[PDB]
UniProtKB/Swiss-Prot annotation, chains A, B:
Modified residues (N6-carboxylysine): K137
Pfam families linked: PTE
Domain of life: Archaea
Disulfide feature: none
Enzyme Commission (EC) number: 3.1.8.1
Catalytic temperature dependence: Thermostable.
Cofactor requirements of the protein: Co(2+); Fe cation
Protein's recorded name: Aryldialkylphosphatase
Keyword RNA-binding: no
Gene coding for it: php
Activity regulation, per record: Inactivated by EDTA and o-phenanthroline.
pH note: Optimum pH is 7.0-9.0.
Organism expressing this protein natively: Saccharolobus solfataricus (strain ATCC 35092 / DSM 1617 / JCM 11322 / P2) (Sulfolobus solfataricus)
Function in brief: Has a low paraoxonase activity. Also active, but with a lower activity, against other organo-phosphorus insecticides such as Dursban, Coumaphos, pNP-butanoate or parathion.
C-alpha cells in the first residue's frame, strides 16, 4: 500500500496496471465557478466524466491519474462520485497551477508555507476528506519561470523530499520552461526519475525532448506529427521515458488513433506495455 | 425602489441614510479556500462580521456597501446570514478584482461576454439568488493598466450603460491608475459622477487627488497624514467629492479616530453629513 486512491484503500505501485497518467475528469476556474455558477452544469460534467472513464476501462485501463489541482478546480467529492459510479482506480494530486503570479493569499508567505499545503494533502487528506494526494502537479508557460512560479517549483521539491511522492509538470514546448523545471527540481535534490515533464508533444524539436529524457526524467507527449514524434522517439529507444496521455471552461483518441497508428508502424505490444504499465510503475515506485 | 439590498426589498436612494461606502464583511481567495478549507473558519468570520456591523449601527450607520467581488471571495449567502442577524441595509456588487491577468476561463472571450456576467448579477441576481448587484467594482494596481485590466474596465462601462449602476474602483495611489480608470470610463460614456476612484488616501499628492475630483468623480480616502489630507481637502472645499471608509487572508476607526479628529479641527456636522449621507445619495441616485 504505497499509492493512495480516491474512495479506496491504497495499493502497491506494482499493482497499478495499465495507467492513463494524465487525464482530467473535469476542469474549471475556482473563482468563476463560485461567482457565476449559472455558467456550469455539474450533472453534465459528471455524466461526461463517468462515460469517459467507462470507455477507458473498456480498453483495459485499470488506473487513471487526474492532475487537477488549485487553478484548475480540483474537487475531491466530485472525484469520489466518479469512482463510486465506475470502480476505477483514481490517483488525485496536490499542487498549484499558475503561469504568472499566485493568489493574493500567498502575498508575504514562504516557500515552506506553500510546501506545507502540499504535505497536508499528502499526509492528512484533500479538502477535509481522508483521500490523500499521491503526487504534486506544477506549471509554467509563456511567461517563463517567474518569481512565483519558482516558489511553487521549490515547494514541490520540499514536498517530494518529505513524502517521496513524484512530481508532474506542465511546460511550454517552445521556451525551455520544461528544462528549467527539471534543473531547478534536481538542484533541490529531487531524483530526476521522479519527474514527468509534460506537454512536450507540441514541439517537433526532438533534440529538446531527448535532452530532458537523457537527464533521467519522463517526457509527457500530451496528430500525425505528434504520433510521428512519438514513433521517432520510440524507434530511437526512448520508450522507457515516454508517457502518453490526452490531457474545461478524448480518452479513446489514444486507443482509436495513437496506439493503432503505432502498432501498424512496427511497435509491438511490449513497447505499449512499457509506456502504459512499466513507466507509471517506476514513476510511482 | 432603486437600490437593491441583500435579503430585503429595494429602497429609494434618498432613504439610504448614513452610509459606509466601502466595507468588506469578509475577503479571501476563492481558489485557496476551495482547495485548502483547513485554513479558514467561517464561524469566526461570521461572528466578526456581525460584531462589526453591530458596532457600526451603534454609531448610527444605516447602510453598508460591501464591494467584495470575484477575486476577493464574494459570498451572497454569507452576506444574507449577516443581514438576518443584524437588520443592516447591505448593498452587494458585481465585478472583477485583478491586477494582471484574468482567470483561464476568460481566454478568448470578449468584453461583451464579461459585461454580460455583470449584467446577469444586476438584473437576474447573484450566485443563484434573487439578491441583485447595485454597483460594479474593478481594480488596478502596481502593474498598471494591462490588457485584461482594460477589458474589465470597458466591461464595467457597458454594464453601467445598460443598467445605470455606479462604478467603484481600487487604484494605486502612486502610479496614476486612478486617473486612467476615470479617463477610460468617461471616454466610454460613463458619467464621471457615477465613478468612485478609491484607495487614494495613501498618497499625499493632493494635486493628483484634486485632479480626479475636479473631473467630477468621487475620491475614496480609504493616519494623521491621512486625516491631514482629508482635512486639507475639506478646507479646500472638496467635501462634496470625498467618500471615507476603512476598507482578509476596523469600522469604529472612523468614529473613534477620524471623525473625532475632524470635528475638533473645525469641520461641523454639516460636512460630516455631506460625506456620509449626501455623497452616497448622489452616487446611487
Ligand atoms: Co498541462
Ligand atoms: Co481596494
Ligand atoms: Fe493537463
Ligand atoms: Fe476594499
Amino acid at each position: 500500500m504505497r499509492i493512495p486512491l480516491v474512495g479506496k484503500d491504497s495499493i502497491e505501485s506494482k499493482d497499478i496496471g495499465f495507467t492513463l497518467i494524465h487525464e482530467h475528469l473535469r476542469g474549471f476556474s475556482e473563482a468563476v465557478r463560485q461567482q457565476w455558477p449559472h455558467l456550469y452544469n455539474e450533472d453534465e460534467e459528471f455524466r461526461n466524466a463517468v462515460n469517459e472513464v467507462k470507455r477507458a476501462m473498456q480498453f483495459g485501463v485499470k488506473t487513471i491519474v487526474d492532475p487537477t489541482v488549485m487553478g484548475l478546480g480540483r474537487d475531491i467529492r466530485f472525484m469520489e462520485k466518479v469512482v463510486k459510479a465506475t470502480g476505477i482506480n483514481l490517483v488525485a494530486g496536490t499542487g498549484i497551477y499558475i503561469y504568472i503570479d499566485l493568489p493574493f493569499y500567498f502575498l508575504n508567505r514562504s516557500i515552506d508555507e506553500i510546501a506545507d499545503l502540499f504535505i497536508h494533502d499528502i499526509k492528512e487528506g484533500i479538502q477535509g476528506t481522508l483521500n490523500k494526494a499521491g503526487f504534486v502537479k506544477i506549471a509554467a508557460d509563456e511567461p517563463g519561470i517567474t518569481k512565483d512560479v519558482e516558489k511553487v517549483i521549490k515547494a514541490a521539491a520540499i514536498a517530494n523530499k518529505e513524502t517521496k511522492v513524484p512530481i508532474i509538470t506542465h511546460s511550454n514546448a517552445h521556451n525551455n520552461t520544461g528544462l528549467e523545471q527539471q534543473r531547478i527540481l534536481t538542484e533541490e535534490g529531487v531524483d530526476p526519475g521522479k519527474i514527468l515533464i509534460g506537454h512536450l508533444g507540441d514541439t517537433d524539436n526532438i533534440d529538446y525532448i531527448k535532452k530532458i529524457a537523457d537527464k533521467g526524467s519522463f517526457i509527457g507527449l500530451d496528430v500525425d506529427k505528434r504520433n510521428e514524434t512519438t514513433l521517432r522517439l520510440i524507434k530511437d529507444g526512448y520508450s522507457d521515458k515516454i508517457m502518453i496521455s490526452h490531457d474545461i471552461d478524448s480518452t479513446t483518441l489514444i486507443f482509436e488513433d495513437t496506439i493503432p497508428f503505432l502498432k501498424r508502424n512496427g511497435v509491438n505490444e511490449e513497447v505499449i506495455a512499457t509506456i502504459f504499465k512499466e513507466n507509471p510503475k517506476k514513476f510511482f515506485s
